[PDB]
Design a protein around this motif. Structure first.
Motif, PDB file in Angstrom:
ATOM      1  N   UNK A 209       0.839  -1.196   0.000  1.00  0.00           N
ATOM      2  CA  UNK A 209       0.000   0.000   0.000  1.00  0.00           C
ATOM      3  C   UNK A 209       0.881   1.256   0.000  1.00  0.00           C
ATOM      4  N   UNK A 210       0.280   2.416  -0.280  1.00  0.00           N
ATOM      5  CA  UNK A 210       1.027   3.685  -0.310  1.00  0.00           C
ATOM      6  C   UNK A 210       0.740   4.522   0.939  1.00  0.00           C
ATOM      7  N   UNK A 211       1.688   5.377   1.304  1.00  0.00           N
ATOM      8  CA  UNK A 211       1.526   6.219   2.486  1.00  0.00           C
ATOM      9  C   UNK A 211       0.587   7.390   2.201  1.00  0.00           C
ATOM     10  N   UNK A 212       0.899   8.165   1.165  1.00  0.00           N
ATOM     11  CA  UNK A 212       0.071   9.313   0.801  1.00  0.00           C
ATOM     12  C   UNK A 212       0.563   9.917  -0.516  1.00  0.00           C
ATOM     13  N   UNK A 213      -0.275  10.738  -1.144  1.00  0.00           N
ATOM     14  CA  UNK A 213       0.087  11.371  -2.411  1.00  0.00           C
ATOM     15  C   UNK A 213       0.485  10.318  -3.439  1.00  0.00           C
ATOM     16  N   UNK A 214       1.757   9.934  -3.427  1.00  0.00           N
ATOM     17  CA  UNK A 214       2.250   8.929  -4.360  1.00  0.00           C
ATOM     18  C   UNK A 214       2.056   9.393  -5.801  1.00  0.00           C
TER      19      UNK A 214
END
Length: 17
Positions: free
Chosen positions: A12-17
């Motif tokens: 999964x991604x943390x944020x924005x990406x």
């Protein structure tokens, strides 16, 4: 954080990406 194989949990991604 979110489902999209970003950075977190390497599944999964943390944020924005």
């Amino acid at each position: 954080g979110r489902p999209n194989w970003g950075f977190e949990n390497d599944w999964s991604c943390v944020r924005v990406c």
